[PDB]
Symmetry: D3
Subunit: 156 residues, 6 copies
């Protein structure tokens, strides 16, 4: 069997965009992941518009509503909630999605870049996760048998 995922990753910093590409690649190689039918936010912004790339939409209530709902749909409609996590650059949006994933009863997996693994993460992100792994463990992670595990690291 294969599972689909909601690709929860930011795209506002160099460290973030770096991890984004890495995780994308790991997923592309993982056998247990049906990446084709997965939902990736950046490719599903309303009307293909990226607001950081079109500041005129910074006040469009309809663009916001549509994108927000689309993201939520991407979460409840897929199997796993994957969060690309950067300890030094924690994203509020990802946080909200972790909480929403919890409500939807999804498996919450946080993936931290190998160089950052161990650094302290926020108490809530730690508590809402079902497991926290390193980037290098992503390609071989068996999504058909998701298990609970503690983050081998600090939590502030």
């Amino acid at each position: 069997p294969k599972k689909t995922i909601y690709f929860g990753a930011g795209w506002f910093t160099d460290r973030q965009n770096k991890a984004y590409k890495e995780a994308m690649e790991a997923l592309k190689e993982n056998p247990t992941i049906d990446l084709e039918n997965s939902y990736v936010p950046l490719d599903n912004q309303y009307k293909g518009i990226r607001v950081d790339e079109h500041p005129e939409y910074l006040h469009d209530k309809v663009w916001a509503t549509a994108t927000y709902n689309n993201d939520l749909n991407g979460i409840k409609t897929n199997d796993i909630m994957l969060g690309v996590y950067i300890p030094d650059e924690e994203d509020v949006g990802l946080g909200m999605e972790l909480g929403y994933a919890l409500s939807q009863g999804k498996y919450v997996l946080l993936v931290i870049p190998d160089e950052d693994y161990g650094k302290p993460i926020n108490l809530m992100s730690w508590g809402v996760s079902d497991n926290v792994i390193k980037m290098s463990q992503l390609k071989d992670f068996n999504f058909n048998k998701p298990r609970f595990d503690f983050y081998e690291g600090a939590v502030y």
Copy 2:
């Protein structure tokens, strides 16, 4: 009638600490809020110890589990979810809590310092919110008749 709230507010930067004090003062003046029976995270960390004062707790699963659970209990047993929000220093912890509050069906009110009201806020925060007001309106906000409203500002 009077409502109780969960005081969602970070205390990791000076801007956050300033907003924290202002909000606490506004709430003490609000006739519709019962602050004594509300839940304030900072006075509810497990064993009464803050990890930033006692770094030895950065690696203590028991401390993390209890504090996380106590916070969740603070949201679910209280009427309103209050989030002191600083646009330029958004908190992943507050984000997770907004999602969790949504799952529990609580009114989610964001309060932004007057000087920052209007600056862009994360889409996901705008989405979960039932309303977003400025710090100065907090002391007068009627929590017995909470209603929905859009942020009179930008959202990235």
Copy 3:
């Protein structure tokens, strides 16, 4: 004690409008209801405008989004879900709201005009309901001790 309610009632036919007035009168006489702090949809449409008075809003996503959200907020922040129900003119809107109220764990009480009490009602409405009474009992219903009961009538 006193409870607050969400006034679920259509206003699209004369029978509905008649039932609407009767229920509002019964509620004003109920000592266990706090009507001032309750949510009445008709006084809460976005921007205070009813689409039947201003048809131009029939095509306004912003109006639709805000009004829909405000209604949901009205159900989740109030104690009881009241549904004025007319067996011969059942409302799809009221139906959706019953389902939503169930999801929020609210007591769902249907109130049917005396003259119609007994006529067949949709299975799904009978199912979500915690009790169904006639209009005449509304003024005396004790909302501080709501209990479950079967419709003394038919269900198609």
Copy 4:
């Protein structure tokens, strides 16, 4: 992959029964739908009894309980919540199911007959839906990649 659905459709009017057959046919041709393991209410009424066809059961608390629970099970147990929607003949039962589907975190798709598409629909039905399409779009709808979209029509 293929998805299963809860066939939410009324059967109380000529327009309704017409759309029912049409949608059934569209689903029968859609590649992304596993119609065999889907749940269709009319074939799952308790003991095969249709109350509109056996008025003696109009007062059977056990028949109602069983059918109501069976329908709910049909919803939470399947992937997509499909609602066959007739603007001029909105069903309260379908409404309740849309709300229940929301709580269950299912994708809510409303399908309106091509001749009716555009006509005004109830505010709540509009707001609970993840997407609203035309009958003709049903056969080709890709259920493995469900996305959010606004109804190109009026909402009262």
Copy 5:
């Protein structure tokens, strides 16, 4: 303020019946509890009949459905979920109710007779609980500020 509770307690053994009486007495002395408006299962079985007094009801789906539903309604409309717990005679019914209370976001408090406080309790009960105290503390417990705490005892 005062809170209402759902009195979760078995009455199938002498130890249970003893604990039942002690807890009821402690609750009558608690200034933060409104016992009149609370829900006591034993006074809420359908038609007022207990199946152990009228065994003929052991085979009556209607009795079972109404009593089950009334109990659920008792949990969802009340503030606190109280579970009188006897470690050596754990109740499957109370267990299901703890899970249900968790789903409704209620504070779950277990109360164990002093003589038994400390004995091993089922993992799942320890997990859902927000706190577990001994019978003697019940009369003084402040239900207006419920907080999380670990069982000072064993868990098998």
Copy 6:
């Protein structure tokens, strides 16, 4: 298609361990069950430690937290909630899981040993189940088409 299950069964009595093995066998033969990717508690106790087999962990807050969370994850992450039920030896832990399964929107199937089928079961276990079958019906049960059905037996 095939479905996965959360194997909910006790292991504290001879009758329990007997049914456990039986059900295991039935599942091993059932075509509609993907037993390999299913979650079975006994093989997923934290660190492979069984506390009944290592009483030193009877006070390990970390072992309890981890196992409890792992079990919950096993429930929300799988399709069906299967409960091996012994009428004379009802388990509180299984009860809590039935309630949690309900919240997660899973199909709840109780399987009773053929020799015990008919004996009275707790009102709540009866009410939370979507269907109750005999051990002998397990091997042939079609999990791709789960339907609702009443327990042909007594409920106390």
